[PDB]
Design a protein around this ligand. Structure first.
Ligand SMILES: [Zn+2]
Ligand SMILES: [Zn+2]
Ligand SMILES: [Zn+2]
Ligand SMILES: [Zn+2]
Lengths: 28, 28, 28, 28
């Protein structure tokens, strides 16, 4: 289970889609 | 942004998510 | 937060992606 | 399969997920 941001390559477990989506609200 | 599973470590583009699901439908 | 299966239109909160993906392992 | 958010009830195809994220980047 994993998700990785495109510009900065940060880790987020798949069951944490809300966390990941909150990371792409803020800029990186 | 990437999609990665912790069964085989295959990566997937995020927009290509329906491909990630076809892979997860069946075991690896 | 929501996900809906294509063939049978079942509900899954977005923070439950693992549940949804397990529903498309089994057939409906 | 559909993507739906509980802020405005906009639906999205699942394969078109990167569009759902662009919508969630900004408030509604
Ligand atoms: Zn990032
Ligand atoms: Zn795999
Ligand atoms: Zn179903
Ligand atoms: Zn919305």
């Amino acid at each position: 289970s994993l998700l990785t941001c495109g510009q900065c390559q940060m880790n987020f477990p798949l069951g944490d889609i809300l966390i990941f989506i909150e990371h792409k609200r803020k800029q990186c």
